[PDB]
Each structure stands twice: as C-alpha cells, then as structure tokens.
C-alpha cells in the first residue's frame, strides 16, 4: 500500500468546525504531523496552531486524527516571525501531513463556501 491522506469534509466548514485527516502508506516509523497550513509565497507556510495534532506512521503508517479549521487561521510563519491571520479566502489552505525532516504527504485543498 502507498502512502496517501483521506481528508474531509474539505469544503463546507465554516468558522468554528472540525475536519478529519487521514494518513495511509506513510514512512511505516516516523512521527508525521497533521494540521491546516497555507503556502502564500516560495517557501512561506502559515499553519494555524488549531489542527496541529501528530502521530507515527505505524506498520504502513496510518494517521487519522480531526482538528478545527477554518478560513482565517494564525499564519504560524516556520521561522519564529507570524505571518499575520491568515484569511483562507485568499489563499489555498491544504489539511495534509509532514514529517521533522523537510516535508512528507501533500495536503488537501479545502473551501469555505
Ligand atoms: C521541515 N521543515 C519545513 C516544513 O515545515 C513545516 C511547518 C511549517 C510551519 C510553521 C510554524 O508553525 C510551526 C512552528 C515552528 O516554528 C514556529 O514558530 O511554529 C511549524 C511547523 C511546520 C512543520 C512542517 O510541516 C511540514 O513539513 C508540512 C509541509 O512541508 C507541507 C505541508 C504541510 C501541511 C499541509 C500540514 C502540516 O501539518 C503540520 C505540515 C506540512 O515546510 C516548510 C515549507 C519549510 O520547508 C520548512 O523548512
């Protein structure tokens, strides 16, 4: 089995609510994270400390775990500075999972109608 991540709802979340990651076919022995994070430039990721949960990628390395997200969401800058609020309305929010060493899975894009 290859490493994947079921994610939803990934649209119709409003402010306020809950959505499920999911991670299947992950290194099979490396704690991965799982939250709502955002790229609004080459190297800029605002993630929002809401949906910041984490688990290891087991036999295969499935991770299901839900979280709150929303349109804005503090722009948790990876570099010690915040990048401000960071409204989903204007940028693409991606609910995926990632490693300690440089990345991991992709994320999914979510809408907020
Ligand atoms: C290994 N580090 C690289 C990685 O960093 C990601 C990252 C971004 C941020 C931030 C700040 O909130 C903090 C802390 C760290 O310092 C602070 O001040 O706050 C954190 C963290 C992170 C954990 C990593 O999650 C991920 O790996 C990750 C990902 O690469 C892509 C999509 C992800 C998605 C969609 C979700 C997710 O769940 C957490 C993780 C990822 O990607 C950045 C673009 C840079 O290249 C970093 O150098």
């Given at each position: 089995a290859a490493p994947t991540a079921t994610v939803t709802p990934s649209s119709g979340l409003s402010?306020?609510?809950?959505?499920?990651?999911?991670?299947?076919?992950?290194?099979?022995?490396?704690?991965?994270?799982?939250?709502?994070?955002?790229?609004?430039?080459?190297?800029?990721?605002?993630?929002?400390?809401?949906?910041?949960?984490?688990?290891?990628?087991?036999?295969?390395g499935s991770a299901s775990t839900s979280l709150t997200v929303r349109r804005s969401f503090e722009g948790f800058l990876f570099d010690g500075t915040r990048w401000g609020t960071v409204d989903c309305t204007t940028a693409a929010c991606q609910v995926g999972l990632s490693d300690a060493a440089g990345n991991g899975p992709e994320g999914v894009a979510i809408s907020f109608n």
């Open positions: 402010d306020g609510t809950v959505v499920k990651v999911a991670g299947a076919g992950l290194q099979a022995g490396t704690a991965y994270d799982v939250g709502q994070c955002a790229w609004v430039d080459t190297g800029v990721l605002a993630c929002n400390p809401a949906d910041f949960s984490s688990v290891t990628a087991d036999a295969n």
